[PDB]
Design a protein around this ligand. Sequence first.
Ligand SMILES: Nc1ncnc2c1ncn2[C@@H]1O[C@H](COP(=O)(O)OP(=O)(O)O)[C@@H](O)[C@H]1O
Ligand code: SF4
Ligand code: SF4
Ligand SMILES: [Mg+2]
Ligand SMILES: [Mg+2]
Ligand SMILES: [Mg+2]
Ligand SMILES: [Mg+2]
Ligand SMILES: [Mg+2]
Ligand SMILES: [Mg+2]
Ligand SMILES: [Mg+2]
Ligand SMILES: [Mg+2]
Ligand SMILES: [Mg+2]
Ligand SMILES: [Mg+2]
Ligand SMILES: [Mg+2]
Ligand SMILES: [Mg+2]
Ligand SMILES: [Mg+2]
Ligand SMILES: [Mg+2]
Ligand SMILES: [Mg+2]
Ligand SMILES: [Mg+2]
Ligand SMILES: [Mg+2]
Ligand SMILES: [Mg+2]
Ligand SMILES: [Mg+2]
Ligand SMILES: [Mg+2]
Ligand SMILES: [Mg+2]
Lengths: 184, 258, 582, 134
Amino acid sequence: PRAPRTYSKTYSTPKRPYESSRLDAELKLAGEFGLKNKKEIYRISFQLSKIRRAARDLLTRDEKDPKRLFEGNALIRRLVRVGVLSEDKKKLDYVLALKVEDFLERRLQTQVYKLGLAKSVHHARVLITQRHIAVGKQIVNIPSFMVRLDSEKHIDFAPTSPFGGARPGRVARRNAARKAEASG
Amino acid sequence: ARGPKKHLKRLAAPHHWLLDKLSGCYAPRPSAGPHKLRESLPLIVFLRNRLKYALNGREVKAILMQRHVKVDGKVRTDTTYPAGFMDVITLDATNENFRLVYDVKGRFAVHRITDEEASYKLGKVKKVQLGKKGVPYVVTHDGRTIRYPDPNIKVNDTVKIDLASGKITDFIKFDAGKLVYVTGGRNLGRIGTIVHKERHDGGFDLVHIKDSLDNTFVTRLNNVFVIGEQGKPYISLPKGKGIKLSIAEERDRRRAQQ
Amino acid sequence: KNSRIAIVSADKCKPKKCRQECKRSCPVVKTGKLCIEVTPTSKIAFISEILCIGCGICVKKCPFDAIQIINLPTNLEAHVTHRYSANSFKLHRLPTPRPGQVLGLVGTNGIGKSTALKILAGKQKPNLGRFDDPPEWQEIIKYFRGSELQNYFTKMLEDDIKAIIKPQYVDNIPRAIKGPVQKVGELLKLRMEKSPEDVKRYIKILQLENVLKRDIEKLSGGELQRFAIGMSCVQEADVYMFDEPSSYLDVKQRLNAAQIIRSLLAPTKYVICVEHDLSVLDYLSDFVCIIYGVPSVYGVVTLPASVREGINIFLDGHIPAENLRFRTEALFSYPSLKKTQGDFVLNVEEGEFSDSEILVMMGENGTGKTTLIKLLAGALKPDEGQDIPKLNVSMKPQKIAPKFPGTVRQLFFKKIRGQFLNPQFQTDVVKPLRIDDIIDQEVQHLSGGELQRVAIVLALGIPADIYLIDEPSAYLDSEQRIICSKVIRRFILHNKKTAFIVEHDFIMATYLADKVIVFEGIPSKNAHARAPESLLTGCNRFLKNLNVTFRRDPNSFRPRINKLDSQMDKEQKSSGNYFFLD
Amino acid sequence: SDAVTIRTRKVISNPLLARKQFVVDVLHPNRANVSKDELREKLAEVYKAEKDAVSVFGFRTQFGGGKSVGFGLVYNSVAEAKKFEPTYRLVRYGLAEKVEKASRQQRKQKKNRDKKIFGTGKRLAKKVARRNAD
RNA sequence: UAUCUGGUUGAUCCUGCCAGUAGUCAUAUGCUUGUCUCAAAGAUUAAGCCAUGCAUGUCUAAGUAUAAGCAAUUUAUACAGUGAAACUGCGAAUGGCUCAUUAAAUCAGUUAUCGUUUAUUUGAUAGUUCCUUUACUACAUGGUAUAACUGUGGUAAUUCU
RNA sequence: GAUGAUUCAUAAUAACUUUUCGAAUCGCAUGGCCUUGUGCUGGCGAUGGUUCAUUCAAAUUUCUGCCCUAUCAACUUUCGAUGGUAGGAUAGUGGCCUACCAUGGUUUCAACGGGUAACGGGGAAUAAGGGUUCGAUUCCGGAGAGGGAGCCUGAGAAACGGCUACCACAUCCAAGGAAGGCAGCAGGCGCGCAAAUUACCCAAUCCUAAUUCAGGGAGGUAGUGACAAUAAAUAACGAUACAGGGCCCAUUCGGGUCUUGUAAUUGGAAUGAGUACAAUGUAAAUACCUUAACGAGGAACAAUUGGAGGGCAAGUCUGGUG
Ligand SMILES: Nc1ncnc2c1ncn2[C@@H]1O[C@H](COP(=O)(O)OP(=O)(O)O)[C@@H](O)[C@H]1O
Ligand code: SF4
Ligand code: SF4
Ligand SMILES: [Mg+2]
Ligand SMILES: [Mg+2]
Ligand SMILES: [Mg+2]
Ligand SMILES: [Mg+2]
Ligand SMILES: [Mg+2]
Ligand SMILES: [Mg+2]
Ligand SMILES: [Mg+2]
Ligand SMILES: [Mg+2]
Ligand SMILES: [Mg+2]
Ligand SMILES: [Mg+2]
Ligand SMILES: [Mg+2]
Ligand SMILES: [Mg+2]
Ligand SMILES: [Mg+2]
Ligand SMILES: [Mg+2]
Ligand SMILES: [Mg+2]
Ligand SMILES: [Mg+2]
Ligand SMILES: [Mg+2]
Ligand SMILES: [Mg+2]
Ligand SMILES: [Mg+2]
Ligand SMILES: [Mg+2]
Ligand SMILES: [Mg+2]
């Protein structure tokens, strides 16, 4: 037989199912960021837990330690590159103080809304999903895309779409067909 | 059970071949030859996965049967012929000459050598004894038997082998101040001068070794291959020269050239 | 989803020592019912067939492995291949054609054996049980995914396969001609589709020599069948079907009929046939496929078997491959003295046609058996008088022909209602036969096989002076032959009448023979009849005249043909004793 | 056809197999794909060898369109191409003809059928052709 | 991601269990089911029983060819191209399946053969034999078979012969 | 000469042998030199062959490490149990076996027995730290081919897609006889709470063979598949009617800008699910990726599954039963 495919699970449900504070918190997050279920919030809190566990394992190590220097610089670099971690706060103690809204501001949905091509997070979601968006010269239809802060300058409409031009679309071409039918 | 095995699953193949874990259940099992199957490189993985001159094993066989590649001067139209340490590989179309030497990461390197250098190889003597009718011989690390050797050649020396004839050109002894190649173990690929060797009667003589940046290490005598005196080696060393930069210095060097 | 029943074996059930653990265990016994009746003095435990749910608890709770669960046939509502219509016959499986080889279909008539062949040929595209909206070929093939039939059906759409069926109805084919009228030969000539010389000459093998020149309509059923085979054999086709080839053929022809079909076989070619006679199937088929199910309701095709194992399963009635029991285990003076046409002289020879004691009258194919029976009925007179009009005949034609819009039960009124006494009279004889089913149906679209059975009952009705059943073997299954022979037998004791049965089979003949009119003579050229010879003598003469020997099976008394040159066959010619159980 | 701009990349000359092997990057805006035959014609005019010496395969089209990336081989002559290229690609290009074969099971059945016979089989055949009398 | 909560009493604080709560490359089952990628799958009970078909064969310039096989020549009246059968040679001891047995047994890491077998691969390596040694002879080359084949057959039947 | 160490490598002498091996083999190229005979001589291979070394292996072997049980405290030892000496057998070491001899060997630090719904390991799940439970199953090792035992061939088997017998099943038969082994791949019965197609192919991965070519249910490909795992549709936006703040006003219950949500109020835009030319994909297809043509909007293309006293999110309801 062939080598097994590795897979892993990307979220984790919380321990107490029904607690009113956490429910109202996650509904505020879902409404402000335009999310469809609690699995997205669980995905981000899982990713943040993994980052915090690695940083917790490095801060127990003393300073000048080669593992701590190497992997702390790499983790800090990946966080400042994706834009979750600010340029001044680069000291592996700010890494611990991160929270899920820092990750949620960097999704392509909220970035399309903040750049102003959208007018809503929900409009941004459907604009992404229906393929009118291109982060480089390449279409992305995944709302959780986590743009890398030199890609923020290049989020724009897709060339092979309306709103980036050169052919209108199904319902517009139908309505034009009816009006040209009535003219002749 | 019941006899010798003829297959070799992928994930059981040696890791330094760098065969990806998908794309097939099997790996090319090296046929019996001059080298042990773990410390060897079949010509299929050298021609396909390292030189990219073929896309299939079928194309490697198509290359081999027109007698293009020859290894240590002999033609060898075998797909899984074990090419090992210090073997020369000649590709007469493109007139190319490789020597199998390790890079410091522990893998076999694509070390292009010149046409004058392809005329020889080094061998580490594994035993000296007297054969029948009192004729002495040596056995090098790739199993070549050479009759009537010099009486000064004892074990763990390196002899320079001619590869048109099987004759011995010269030889490097084993003492302090000798340039060595580590072939085996954790430190596989490093080059350093020997400082001293530890007797240890009863098993596993150790030898202490320091590279050009004055980093010492120690190795069993089984994994050490003397390649000359300090300064000149008897072969051309690959890029890197067996230095073993740490990962910190390695990403610093990568951020220089990037 | 088949119904499961527990059977108890007479071997290794020993009630005196068993402590009746089967009975205590049973849930149905606990609810009150006597599902298992067993006492310590008893010979054998009894398990009720209809009061067993088949849980299998009894099987585990026996000191001995005396109990065993088997399946039973049932409607399945799954894996359906074809429905003709709403509340119509359902075909569940489909037999898989094998290349190079003969594949035989065995089952009761009306089970869908003919339905299978049409489906395989492409004539009747399956609907997968959707009569209302038949699926197209794209959907049929995707149903068949994972099977050899998918690749086989894909080829048929691409015209990679040519498949011909040999029709099971001999009677239909004379009606439809290439032209208004034609003799036998010119039909063959245009569709020879094979060089005569280079291939083996089927016409010499299929004994068609004289009948190349007769017009097709005059031919009897016996001759006609060998013509039907000839039309399929001349074709060049990838797959070959043969429906009921044995019918209207005598013992020598049947062996030759076995010989011709196998000669077609090639590595590319496929040959699949549905044959009812067990004995010919020994030399006909590599593999045997059993079909089963209630007739005209449903039918299920099973896994193939090799013939020796296949035939023995069919006689046993219990397929071991699929753990079911499908329950079919087989177990006065009138000296006419001439009749001619000028071409075929059936010179008769004197007979004392006996009193009230059934007689066979048995011939060969061209030997003109019907002429005698036409002459016992007054018709086809001798030229030079000496014609006795004494006898009154209830005959039944070989070529039974429907001319009327009749529902069966009304045809029961029209001729055969009679007095219809309950004991030992026409009511009693009907009960074994399944004629109670067919009363509703129209005779015109009553099946050919069933039409034979209705004619058999129809003819027996009027006592007259002498009913003469002509050729009652055709279009009946194996089991139906056993029933029909006994039903003739029981009736014909009760009437003090006689019958001249015109069989082309042998095994029914031997069961229904007290004296034997033999028909030595060249077939299809001037014959000579003989006297009504006694049973042991009369089979043996005919058996001498063909060089065929029959052996009596030790276990089951089934009559099996011998090899043409073999130790038993040589022994029985030397001993003179061509037959047994005389 | 809108400006397919075929760019060969990672080119390396392989004289062992008498060819050049390269990754082909084709930008085809406003168009679904580019067909392999038109690719072969354009590459044949780029490397100037022939059409029947060039081979393409690979060719996953990028998500969102506008690009597909494949693998190409131009050969040294059509003789060398017909001696090193696989037959499925030669019959794909129309250079060889698909030999019609029996299916894999039918070949296996025939091989097992011939395993049961010792020798040519003529004596067994003439024995059954004799015993057709008996 | 170092968290608990409900239930003994008229109320209280405890012991203490029950109950909840979260997960499961843990199975099964119910209801429901649009898309993309990826994927386990007759282990548990029965290492219970098996209809059918397939899964082990193999040819090079280079062991043997008079197929009464197929081809076209023009080297070649001994053969010489392609190529069935058959003999010879290798292979069938690898692979795949399963987990019954097995508790210092297997196994794992670590040793040993100065206590042994090893087809193959790779490298080395064999002037000595005219066995009575002036011929008793063939060494510019010695003897039998036997298969396939051809023909005659047996058995109900077998990869029988 | 070597090794930590040898009666080691190797050499010599005297014999032995029932006498091992020491080329009667094949393909291409066809030269060189002559007193010119079909003279002498000569290239690159292929196959074989003795011995040594090497490689692929094997067989034994050292040290340490295994779940529960004392309602298992003594176990082994005429029939090897522990050791000694000789032999035999083995590829070789050894109670491996035999002959003779001695009386040993293990054990509360748990021997020996029993049980295991026990193949071992890499590993898996869940864990703050420590742990607990599992590992039939993608790799490594072992064992087995219905149960036992015996053997042939071969370098290698105590081989089962080899043979021989017995025991248990079981097929054909002309009753004389013959043939069996799915814990391979499909498939069937049985069992059960429990698990898929009697499909396509050597294109890839590799293996075998005289061998680039043939073969491979190994392996790949599609089918079935809510076992787990990843991403992620089921709508987005206006214009107008309805429930809101200071203020421009300093024009008392007047427009309400600047928003927030309801609407038996209306508008266009947007897109895939799906269908389908085509090309790509592939051994050939299917599908994905791409893409003409079609494909939306409220009875359409309509999300379920469990709940609403507490634990534990969510009823100050309305009928029914009693
Ligand atoms: N063409 C048909 N249309 C409708 N019903 C049919 C048709 N043919 C047969 N049947 C019914 O279904 C059954 C199919 O079996 P049939 O075709 O007669 O094969 P068999 O010869 O095995 O009975 C018949 O018994 C008959 O009652
Ligand atoms: S198996 Fe049946 S017959 Fe035998 S002891 Fe049990 S109940 Fe009685
Ligand atoms: S199968 Fe069940 S119901 Fe039937 S006899 Fe046995 S125990 Fe009774
Ligand atoms: Mg190999
Ligand atoms: Mg019919
Ligand atoms: Mg109390
Ligand atoms: Mg109380
Ligand atoms: Mg609990
Ligand atoms: Mg194995
Ligand atoms: Mg060698
Ligand atoms: Mg001894
Ligand atoms: Mg001893
Ligand atoms: Mg077990
Ligand atoms: Mg188990
Ligand atoms: Mg294993
Ligand atoms: Mg074994
Ligand atoms: Mg079994
Ligand atoms: Mg065995
Ligand atoms: Mg088997
Ligand atoms: Mg199976
Ligand atoms: Mg609900
Ligand atoms: Mg409720
Ligand atoms: Mg309610
Ligand atoms: Mg509450």
